[PDB]
Ligand binder design. Structure first.
Ligand SMILES: O=c1ccn([C@H]2C[C@H](O)[C@@H](COP(=O)(O)NP(=O)(O)OP(=O)(O)O)O2)c(=O)[nH]1
Ligand SMILES: [Mg+2]
Ligand code: NA
Ligand code: NA
Ligand code: NA
Length: 326
DNA sequence: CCGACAGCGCATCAGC
DNA sequence: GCTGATGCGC
DNA sequence: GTCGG
């Protein structure tokens, strides 16, 4: 974290642009710059030096000079003092409450944790659960705990159908010492790109995880994606573990590699890699990698037999999961 | 100078 | 209900 | 806010 001060600043600006200004591209621009700077192996001495990195432009270079000279950014200092901005940024910290809903709650006078707690009947299901576990959801998950959760999920999925294959992706698969949540990619031979010879594949698994009391709440649930809450069990007299966010993504068995590439991230790594793919004349999603006709129409899916094959198509040297934490 | 910015699942909504 | 745009998050 | 055509 040679440039932790600078990256935090850019990150705070990104969150401002997303939650308050509602300018998603400025948000992504700041996140991109913070990312490229975070992996820069030198302690940045100036904005000029930073402007050499891809993603860092004139505006950010100037902010970096101000920050380096004073240790602060007036622009942020003022933002931190604006009541509306502060209210919106706080409210968006509740899962399910986005930029729009946050600004709307303010208009209605709901702008603090206490306000939210006395107005649950005004929150949709997702927001209600986000408020319920407001504190827990901001706690990190130690890898050791992720290892315990993995054992449970994999073992429970096996009990349902020995043919299910569950893989923990996200920051965990990238080797993180702590994760924000758990990401599980699920496959079953009955569900392929050609057919779904069996229904309730995702339902069965969720059902089984709820039965053993691993999954405690549901934020959203569909045929291929589940978003909810889980908790490791605690021993006698032992204090309870915090409730954790968990996402389960069922993907066509024959499209596992594209699926694991996507669910391993990071999100910025995916944005960078997908952007590169385009420049190389391909389009990548969690299911396939396809070429792009002159027109701009995705052609047919290209054969893929490993994560590496995806890298090869776009002429990128393979990068292990551990090196995708952008 | 200026168009584009990765790609998509689920919940919710308005219009018909 | 069906359909498509919108909000939100992964 | 940044970048490539
Ligand atoms: O905008 C997004 C968000 C997520 N993703 C993918 C990549 C990411 O690694 C994966 C899991 O989403 P999380 O939000 O859980 N991120 P990650 O697991 O990498 O980090 P964290 O430790 O915060 O959960 O989903 C995208 O492709 N685009
Ligand atoms: Mg995750
Ligand atoms: Na640059
Ligand atoms: Na939120
Ligand atoms: Na997740």
């Amino acid at each position: 974290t040679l440039n932790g001060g600078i990256t935090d600043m850019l990150t705070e600006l990104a969150n401002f642009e997303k939650n308050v200004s509602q300018a998603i591209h400025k948000y992504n621009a700041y996140r991109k710059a913070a990312s490229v700077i975070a992996k820069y192996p030198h302690k940045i001495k100036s904005g000029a030096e930073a402007k050499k990195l891809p993603g860092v432009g004139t505006k950010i270079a100037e902010k970096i000079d101000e920050f380096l000279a004073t240790g602060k950014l007036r622009k942020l200092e003022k933002i931190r003092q604006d009541d509306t901005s502060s209210s919106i940024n706080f409210l968006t910290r509740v899962s399910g409450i986005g930029p729009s809903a946050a600004r709307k709650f303010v208009d209605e006078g709901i702008k603090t944790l206490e306000d939210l707690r006395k107005n649950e009947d005004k929150l949709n299901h997702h927001q209600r659960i986000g408020l319920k576990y407001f504190g827990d959801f901001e706690k990190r998950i130690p890898r050791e705990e992720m290892l315990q959760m993995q054992d449970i999920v994999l073992n429970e999925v096996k009990k349902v159908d020995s043919e299910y294959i569950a893989t923990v992706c996200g920051s965990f698969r990238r080797g993180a010492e702590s994760s924000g949540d758990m990401d599980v990619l699920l496959t079953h031979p009955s569900f392929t790109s050609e057919s779904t010879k069996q229904p309730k594949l995702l339902h069965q698994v969720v059902e089984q995880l709820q039965k053993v009391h691993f999954i405690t709440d549901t934020l959203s649930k569909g045929e291929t994606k589940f978003m909810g809450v889980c908790q490791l069990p605690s021993k006698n007299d032992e204090k309870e573990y915090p409730h954790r966010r968990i996402d389960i993504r069922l993907i066509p068995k024959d499209q596992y590699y594209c699926g694991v590439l996507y669910f391993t991230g990071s999100d910025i790594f995916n944005k960078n890699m997908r952007a590169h793919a385009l420049e190389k004349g391909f389009t990548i999603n969690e299911y396939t990698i396809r070429p792009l006709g002159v027109t701009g129409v995705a052609g047919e899916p290209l054969p893929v037999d490993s994560e590496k094959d995806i890298f090869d198509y776009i002429q990128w040297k393979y990068r292990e999961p551990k090196d995708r934490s952008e």
